[PDB]
Design a protein around this ligand. Structure first.
Ligand SMILES: COCCNC(=O)/C=C/c1ccc(Nc2cc(N)c(C#N)c(N[C@]34C[C@H]5C[C@H](C[C@H](C5)C3)C4)n2)cc1OCC#N
Length: 258
């Protein structure tokens, strides 16, 4: 019914998501303004997963000043029992938006890709690599994409291996380039309606398909030949050959309108 956070009451409307021991609510303040509270339950959690949330919050704070493409954290309260994070509510997560609309607008797609690049770039500058970027990681706030988390704390549902970079699958016997791949897979979805490996059902085969160069990824021709080069370059299996964020920010597809 009600939640306190640093001397401010918040009335719960609905629940949006749930995870290991966390919940994301949609709440109203006294002035009937809409927000989102991330609630975490610490009473049950390991010591190596308590400090994940500590890092998550610390970095979420650190990075407010540095970009408006990072989700806004208004205020937070943290004990040994719980965590409350007052954040933006927004309209919809990107994962739930790729499932709703079938035909994606080119102008809107570019705009989102810009946001994504900016947000990821910003975190890359402060030495963080979100080694697990999904569309679930982005929120829409009035036609503007915003990054929700840095993939330090555990992910929530309202789990796929699609966006996983080859080098990560190879790391069984991190680089900023790993996020470029994941971003590649996410822009692919926004272009060809699916991820570059969505059709493959078996997991051990799909992982092999990820690392196997002899598996060639299809790039069907598009009116935007610029978008095609981006993904092409984002999905290079060699992280040394893959395109960087700063290169992508200097790319025709981001910097030039039709
Ligand atoms: C079974 O049906 C449940 C789905 N309910 C909905 O209608 C919500 C979609 C939604 C989804 C997210 C959202 N905004 C936010 C705002 C935030 N500040 C955070 C955080 N942290 C967040 N995180 C999640 C919550 C759920 C689990 C995951 C993925 C996604 C849904 C976004 C993290 N989402 C606002 C949203 O819009 C609310 C409305 N109407």
């Amino acid at each position: 019914e009600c939640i306190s956070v640093k001397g401010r009451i918040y009335s719960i409307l609905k629940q949006i998501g749930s995870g290991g021991s966390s919940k994301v609510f949609q709440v109203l303040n006294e002035k009937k303004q809409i927000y989102a509270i991330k609630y975490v339950n610490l009473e049950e959690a390991d010591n190596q997963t308590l400090d994940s949330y500590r890092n998550e919050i610390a970095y979420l704070n650190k990075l407010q000043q540095h970009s408006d493409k990072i989700i806004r954290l208004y205020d937070y309260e943290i004990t040994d029992q719980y965590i409350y994070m007052v954040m933006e509510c927004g309209n919809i997560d990107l994962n739930s938006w790729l499932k709703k609309k079938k035909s994606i607008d080119p102008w809107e797609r570019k705009s989102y890709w810009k946001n994504m690049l900016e947000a990821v770039h910003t975190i890359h500058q402060h030495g963080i690599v979100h080694s697990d970027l999904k569309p679930a990681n982005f929120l829409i706030v009035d036609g503007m994409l915003k990054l929700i988390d840095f993939g330090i704390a555990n992910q929530m549902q309202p789990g796929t291996v699609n966006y996983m970079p080859p080098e990560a699958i190879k790391d069984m016997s991190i680089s900023p380039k790993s996020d470029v791949w994941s971003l590649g897979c996410i822009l692919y979805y926004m272009t060809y309606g699916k991820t570059p490996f969505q059709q493959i059902i078996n997991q051990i085969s799909k992982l092999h398909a990820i690392i196997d160069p002899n598996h060639e990824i299809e790039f069907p021709d598009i009116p935007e030949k610029d978008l095609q080069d981006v993904l092409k370059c984002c999905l290079k299996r060699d992280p040394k050959q893959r395109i960087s964020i700063p290169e992508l920010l200097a790319h025709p597809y981001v910097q030039i309108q039709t």
